[PDB]
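User: I need a structural model of Serine/threonine-protein kinase PAK 1 from Homo sapiens for a docking pre-check later this week. Nothing fancy, just the predicted structure tokens so I can convert them on my end. Input:
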Amino acid sequence: EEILEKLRSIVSVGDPKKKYTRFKIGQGASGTVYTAMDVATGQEVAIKQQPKKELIINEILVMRENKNPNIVNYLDSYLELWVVMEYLAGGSLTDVVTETCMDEGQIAAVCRECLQALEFLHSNQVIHRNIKSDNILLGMDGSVKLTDFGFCAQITPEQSKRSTMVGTPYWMAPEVVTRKAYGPKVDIWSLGIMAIEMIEGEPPYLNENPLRALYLIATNGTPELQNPEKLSAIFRDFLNRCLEMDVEKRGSAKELLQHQFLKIAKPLSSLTPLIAAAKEATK
Ligand SMILES: N[C@H]1CC[C@H](CNc2nccc(Nc3cc(C4CC4)n[nH]3)n2)CC1
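Assistant: Understood. Predicted structure tokens for Serine/threonine-protein kinase PAK 1:
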């Protein structure tokens, strides 16, 4: 594995115990996450800490070469990995969508910020491929930022398509599920599933097993709203252009950013009551 000396090349010297001090907020299997504070300017930071480390390289590379206000900023890296990124204290969007009710103004605000991140990434030939509420972090000010870039596909005019099944089943686009040639608009499909999260609390088929869900997406196509009557006609229009089977007819991030639905978006400060509610429900 000479891929390991490629990772040693990217990282910073050290020592890490001299810039950010120290302080265990959340943890999955793909590493664990912590918190800290910069000694210099007084900035507060988050730090994530075998199998398949090539994803890690891809995550660090893509991150530091695609900086954007709607993307969780990469900062530093040391030696497991000591990936340092900015700290968003509001937490994940998963907590908000599963524990609170969001009105269409709040949903619109989030969709807009996410579309801004996707319009930026796609214009830099990067497909995220794992959009879901779990990879949306919230600031205490209501900022909305995209994270988790390990499954990013870097495309180019010579190979602007992929056909591998990557992502998370409930959020994957039909073309990805059926191993067809797909592009950036798969992120738009995943965004649409995330919008359904924000409405109904979870993606379609979440009560089914991953394979059954995978099978259902492959055969059903566009998912159904339980109560489509609760939504406005312009929100439903927005949804149907995210979740179009015809990739040619599905909306890109650029053209979706101009949809009439995003016009009723509330200020991001309207999200802070959702955050406070999520945290109360979480405790
Ligand atoms: N799929 C995602 C699931 C949640 C995981 C971290 N959990 C968490 N919990 C509370 C606050 C917070 N904030 C936070 C993290 C981070 C960096 C690490 C990315 N910045 N801000 N992050 C990240 C991966």
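Before docking, keep this in mind: The radius of gyration is 19 Å.
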